[PDB]
Amino acid sequence: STGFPLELLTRPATERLAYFENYTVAHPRLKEVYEILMRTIAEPAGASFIFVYGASGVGKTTLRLRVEQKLTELALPKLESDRARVPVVGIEAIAPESRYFNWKEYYTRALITLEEPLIDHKFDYGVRGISRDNFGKINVESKVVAPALRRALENALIHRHPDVFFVDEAQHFGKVASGYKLQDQLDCLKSLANMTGILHCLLGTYELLTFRNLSGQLSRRSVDIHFRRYCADSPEDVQAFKSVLLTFQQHLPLAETPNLVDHWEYFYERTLGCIGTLKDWLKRVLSDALDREATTITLKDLQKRALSVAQCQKMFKEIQEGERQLSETEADVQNLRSALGLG
Amino acid sequence: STGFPLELLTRPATERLAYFENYTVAHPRLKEVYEILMRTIAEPAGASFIFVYGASGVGKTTLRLRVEQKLTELALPKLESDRARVPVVGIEAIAPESRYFNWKEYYTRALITLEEPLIDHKFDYGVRGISRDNFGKINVESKVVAPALRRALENALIHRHPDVFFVDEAQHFGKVASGYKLQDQLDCLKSLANMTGILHCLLGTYELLTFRNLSGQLSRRSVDIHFRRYCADSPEDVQAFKSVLLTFQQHLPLAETPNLVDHWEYFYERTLGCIGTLKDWLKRVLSDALDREATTITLKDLQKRALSVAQCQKMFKEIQEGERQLSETEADVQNLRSALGLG
Ligand SMILES: Nc1ncnc2c1ncn2[C@@H]1O[C@H](COP(=O)(O)OP(=O)(O)OP(=O)(O)O)[C@@H](O)[C@H]1O
Ligand SMILES: Nc1ncnc2c1ncn2[C@@H]1O[C@H](COP(=O)(O)OP(=O)(O)OP(=O)(O)O)[C@@H](O)[C@H]1O
Ligand SMILES: [Mg+2]
Ligand SMILES: [Mg+2]
Numbered sequence A, B: 001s002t003g004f005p006l007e008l009l010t011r012p013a014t015e016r017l018a019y020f021e022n023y024t025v026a027h028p029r030l031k032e033v034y035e036i037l038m039r040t041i042a043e044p045a046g047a048s049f050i051f052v053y054g055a056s057g058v059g060k061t062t063l064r065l066r067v068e069q070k071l072t073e074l075a076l077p078k079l080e081s082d083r084a085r086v087p088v089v090g091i092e093a094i095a096p097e098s099r100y101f102n103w104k105e106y107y108t109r110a111l112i113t114l115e116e117p118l119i120d121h122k123f124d125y126g127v128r129g130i131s132r133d134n135f136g137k138i139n140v141e142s143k144v145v146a147p148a149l150r151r152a153l154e155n156a157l158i159h160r161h162p163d164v165f166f167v168d169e170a171q172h173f174g175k176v177a178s179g180y181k182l183q184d185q186l187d188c189l190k191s192l193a194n195m196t197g198i199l200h201c202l203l204g205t206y207e208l209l210t211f212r213n214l215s216g217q218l219s220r221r222s223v224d225i226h227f228r229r230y231c232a233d234s235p236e237d238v239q240a241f242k243s244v245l246l247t248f249q250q251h252l253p254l255a256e257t258p259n260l261v262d263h264w265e266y267f268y269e270r271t272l273g274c275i276g277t278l279k280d281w282l283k284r285v286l287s288d289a290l291d292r293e294a295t296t297i298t299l300k301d302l303q304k305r306a307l308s309v310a311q312c313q314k315m316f317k318e319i320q321e322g323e324r325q326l327s328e329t330e331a332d333v334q335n336l337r338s339a340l341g342l343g
Helices: A013-022 A028-042 A060-081 A103-114 A146-160 A170-174 A181-196 A206-211 A216-220 A235-250 A261-271 A275-292 A299-304 A309-325 A330-340 B013-022 B028-042 B060-074 B076-081 B103-114 B146-160 B170-174 B181-196 B206-211 B215-220 B235-250 B264-271 B275-291 B299-304 B309-325 B330-340
Strands: A049-054 A088-092 A164-168 A200-203 A222-227 B049-054 B089-092 B165-168 B200-204 B222-227
Touching: A013 A275, A028 A049, A028 A060, A028 A222, A049 A060, A049 A181, A049 A206, A060 A088, A060 A164, A060 A200, A088 A103, A088 B181, A103 A146, A103 B146, A146 A181, A170 A181, A170 A206, A181 A200, A181 A206, A181 A216, A206 A309, A206 B215, A216 A222, A235 A261, A235 A275, A261 A275, A261 A299, A261 B330, A275 A299, A275 B028, A309 B215, A309 B330, B013 B275, B028 B049, B028 B060, B028 B222, B049 B060, B049 B181, B049 B206, B060 B076, B060 B165, B060 B200, B089 B103, B103 B146, B146 B181, B170 B181, B170 B200, B170 B206, B181 B200, B181 B206, B181 B215, B200 B206, B206 B309, B215 B222, B235 B264, B235 B275, B264 B275, B275 B299
Parallel strands: A049 A200, A049 A222, A088 A164, A164 A200, B049 B200, B049 B222, B089 B165, B165 B200
Antiparallel strands: none
């Protein structure tokens, strides 16, 4: 069967909700961005940054988790032979309590997450304020100044040498006091990625576009991957949206499978084409239905957990400007050729 | 009987006052918002923020207490089998002495409130400045830096795994000096919630409409719940108000029950729908009557301890403003249709 297994009906509601949460759908934009990101990670070729953009609601975190699991399963063989290796280190940024991004906390979080191997691996890292303990945890005292933590992290990254270093919600790097300090933050990240030779991938929303192009050097060592949303004007995106709606409808653990493609305009209105938002909506509706133990779904249940107009309006305002900034037309090529003299 | 038991008459005035105080009537808005919040926190589905909007008069605090007691009741059978878990934890935001909201005090109070289980559960928290003591209390040294407290609170939240984190009086987070500080405060809350995977429900007054819509990320990961007051235009609202008032009249531990529905216009004038205002007004009047051992109260008794006009109009100015912004009309729905192209 192409839908949910029928035997889930006898089993209670909790496992049905668990199955729907653990269920993941494949849609053309996700697979295209996934293959592009995997190709870029497989070899950076002098690149130190990947700026993956996309709306609030797209699949960026799920894409990151899928990439990490794929790379781990790819590397496990070589891990069976060569020890002291971590394939992927994936980290999320932290919004600071103060107005300036805390580099010390970023460095100590990197040390914490990066170094969780079997205790057999010992490296007595530089600076005397960082050491192991009786439980395998990494001990970082406040006495350790930030540059010392940077040096220790550089040593650890150089030895372990992960294939890619994920920085989720990278837009938190913009919390700075000086306007010009944005380029300084990006330069600090670039310098960290230079002497370590570790590919840094920056996962962020459209707020990350403030870092998109600063200085020629950062432009050279970065690639722009756009996790575009399924638009409404292009018919093919509409067909993809209807296909993913049907795929979701097939895997709804209900006694009766609801008809869902019919009300696709409402779904596009309240999700803007982002698959994550639609999955959230359907998860909420399914949870409500399973709580009521009703056979099937209705538009009513849909409206109860629907995103309100005001919050959905703000998202599209953010998305409209972000896509406008990231829009590359054939005309833009013409001025580039005209300026260079290739016209 | 549907009212107070008659045995309370023999008991002194203190016992009758206690019985009326611990009594909590139920009204359609209360039960509706309670069910909506229960279904929202039964599963968050990728949502990190709940914005319970309501005037200082409804019943936000008692709704929070009801939710905590309900979930505490629900989690007892699993607690008897599994230790090291807290069903629900919640605190109240602190208005800071200085200009800026103090994150250190917020973090330390959250850690204090969350970590009050039986003394068997030892998790040897991170940061050397956090530990237990001879009396079982959690001691927080002033030398502990704020990010260290944040990491310790994160580890405690992950290990204990609460169902929902309540932040009452959440409008206190707006004590900022920069326009963008207003936003990265909520960004810090969102980072704390994401990194722990814990839903954060924010109960606050209409001042929280400031935190309503900031950027697509916080617009998506938040669901707005409006604790609307019983207005005067809706006949159903008037009927519900009169039913609640009649239940209050029947539940007064008085020797002779007075007729309360007569001065419904006066009661709505001095309460404008807030059930809590009516409740504590009636508590005031009943206590004043019981002080003089009178068999009944009078209009002048209500007038003796009512709410003055100067304040009463002040909530109206705030309330009509918040209800104005929180008004979602069909015109806004069609505006999304035109902008997105689904018209
Ligand atoms: N293709 C997909 N199939 C199934 N579920 C998906 C898919 N894409 C996203 N989700 C759902 O989205 C949620 C994860 O968040 P998601 O990756 O969509 O966030 P994002 O909007 O890309 O990132 P951010 O948090 O930075 O805004 C989960 O509930 C997950 O089930
Ligand atoms: N439905 C209710 N039945 C009985 N008493 C109620 C009810 N709702 C509120 N109260 C009373 O209101 C008081 C608690 O304050 P309440 O939660 O109503 O205030 P609020 O203005 O909504 O919020 P806040 O605490 O932020 O000021 C208590 O005296 C409680 O008895
Ligand atoms: Mg995400
Ligand atoms: Mg209250």
